[PDB]
Amino acid sequence: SDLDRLASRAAIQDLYSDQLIGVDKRQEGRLASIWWDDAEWTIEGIGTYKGPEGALDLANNVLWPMYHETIHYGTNLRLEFVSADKVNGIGDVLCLGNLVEGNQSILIAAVYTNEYERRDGVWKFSKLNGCMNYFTPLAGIHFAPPGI
Amino acid sequence: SDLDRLASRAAIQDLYSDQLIGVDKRQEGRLASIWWDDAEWTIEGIGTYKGPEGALDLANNVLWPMYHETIHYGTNLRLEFVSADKVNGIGDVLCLGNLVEGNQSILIAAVYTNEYERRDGVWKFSKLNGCMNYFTPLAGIHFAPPGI
Amino acid sequence: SDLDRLASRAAIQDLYSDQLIGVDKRQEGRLASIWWDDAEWTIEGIGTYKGPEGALDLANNVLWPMYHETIHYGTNLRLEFVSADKVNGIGDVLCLGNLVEGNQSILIAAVYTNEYERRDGVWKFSKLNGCMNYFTPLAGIHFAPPGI
């Protein structure tokens, strides 16, 4: 469980990246496969959804229909092993995006508070808790592609 | 190839960081040593350059002469092993900088699509593909050092 | 020292994250436990402080009383092993925050230049050197929580 330790770390960094990538590239597959069935994704000011079912439900009915596109930058994944099978973790995340509402470009700073769990040697999200530290629409800036 | 796996991961995260660092700190050495000779660096809206030769050619003739300075923030490196010797990968990258043109401060959000390859136990870039999601000059902000 | 290598890497990424987290979540514990006693934290334009004593002294007497809150995004941690016991490293870091002064929202781009050292199999900061590349107060933006 010292090699095994490094292995878990890897496993989870991919899970964390995959949470983010699956929201930005809107990939249902990637996104649904990271949650244990009793997992809870909570986003402050939205609500709690449970399981991959609920994860996909939030993606399709709230997140994706709210923003033309988003990009989440995830850093500082700081893990703490409670047992070789349960991990808690923080990440700071920066997100840029265009709201459908008013066609607005906005900046979210968030802190994600996580819980990971192993079952049959396989690692998945137990709980993800999103907390928005900053929500700031940018006055005289609109994020656009290079061809406008 | 389970320890060997973690090793490759490390190897590549350094390659990815080195791509970025070598553009921001303008270090020819660091930058030239990460490309296999038949590698292609493609940056949408600029062109494709092949090999370390071409990598250094773009650095000196387009990138560096265009910006007074840049800083690239690289996150979410998500690897997929196709064989113990070929890897595909995404990273989201945030870049801040001053264009020589109009002395403008600008923000690029990019997505990099990568291909890594091992030869004689050593890892290098096979293909890097840059795609700019956001190109936004900032209206009333100029990034400056603290001493202005 | 090939498994041992990957282990050190992990050890330090946590140290690096912990530097940042302990400044943003203002956690004295987390912050004090990462410095060898003869370590130097230098922040250009502020000064040098040495040891955990000095680290906590800067936190409580300069950093924390200057900003209502900060969030540091740390990426590109690029390590170089000088011996299996001394490492040098760069990281690029992005920081957002509200200054108490004028209740201003500002953006710091920094480059951190680090030195790590092992003693009795345990890894700690030897030297951290902060250099601010950008210090830019944002004209018509104030970072706020979502409830304002």
Residue numbers in the entry:
A (entry chain B), B (entry chain B), C (entry chain B): 2 to 149
Paper text:
LinA variants exhibit considerable differences in their thermostability and enantioselectivity. The active site of LinA is largely hydrophobic in character and is located in the characteristic cavity of the tertiary barrel fold. Among other things, H73 functions as a base that abstracts the proton of γ-HCH, leading to its dehydrochlorination. The C-terminal segment has been implicated in the catalytic mechanism of LinA proteins, where based on its spatial position, the enzyme is thought to be in an ‘open’ or ‘closed’ form.
Crystals of LinA-type2 that diffracted to a moderate resolution of 3.5 Å in the space group P6322 were obtained. Molecular replacement studies revealed that the crystal has seven subunits in the asymmetric unit. The structure of the -type2 protein is understandably highly conserved compared to the -type1 protein and therefore it was unanticipated that it would exhibit different enantiomer specificity for α-HCH compared to the -type1 protein. Analysis of the active site residues itself shows that the -type2 protein exhibits several differences including K20Q, F68Y, C71T, L96C F113Y, R129L and A131G, compared to -type1 protein. The main differences T133M, F68Y and A131G, present vicinal to the entrance to the active site in -type2 protein might lead to overall reduced substrate accessibility. Further analysis of the active site and interactions of the substrates in the respective docked complexes were carried out.
